[PDB]
Amino acid sequence: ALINPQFPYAGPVPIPGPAPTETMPLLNYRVEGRIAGIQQARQFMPFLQGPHRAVAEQTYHAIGTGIQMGQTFNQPLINTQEG
Amino acid sequence: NAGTDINYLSQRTANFSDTRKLDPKTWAAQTRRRIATDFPKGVYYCDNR
């Protein structure tokens, strides 16, 4: 702010002001609020809580069976070298 | 075609549950909110950003 003498800035907005209204009042709000609809315990989703496999491992079962059977052919006898 | 060859479009998850099963014009309405106009005939858009 600058004040300049001799033209000085009025020393106030004075008493000639026009009170325009008495509408100043905010009427307090008084209220009762009830949000009470029956609630049912459940919601349907496509899927909740699953941690789906991105790849599975290979998996398997097992079997064996049979017996011990055989047809054989042997090497001929040979002269013994030494000993 | 401008939707006349389609009954509806949708995005559906594994339980048969549709999150936005809409007739073609309503589907187009959602797109108009995104690009301020329609895509060319037969072109349908879905925003999941």
Curated annotation (Swiss-Prot), chain A:
It comes from the Viruses. It is found in: Virion. Pfam families: Tecti-min-caps. GO terms for cellular component: viral capsid. InterPro entries: Tecti-min-caps (IPR015379). The keyword Secreted does not apply. One of its GO terms (biological process) is viral capsid assembly. Keywords: Capsid protein, Virion. Minor capsid protein essential for stable capsid assembly of complete particles. Dimer. This is Minor capsid protein P30. The lineage of its organism: Viruses, Varidnaviria, Bamfordvirae, Preplasmiviricota, Tectiliviricetes.
Swiss-Prot record, chain B:
It comes from the Viruses. It is found in: Virion. Disulfide bonds: none annotated. Major capsid protein self-assembles to form an icosahedral capsid with a pseudo T=25 symmetry, about 66 nm in diameter, and consisting of 240 capsid proteins trimers. The capsid encapsulates an inner membrane and the genomic dsDNA genome. The major coat protein P3 and two assembly factors (P10 and P17) are needed during the assembly of the virus particle inside the host cell, when the capsid protein multimers are capable of enclosing the host-derived membrane, containing the virus-encoded membrane-associated proteins. Homotrimer. This is Major capsid protein P3. The gene is III.
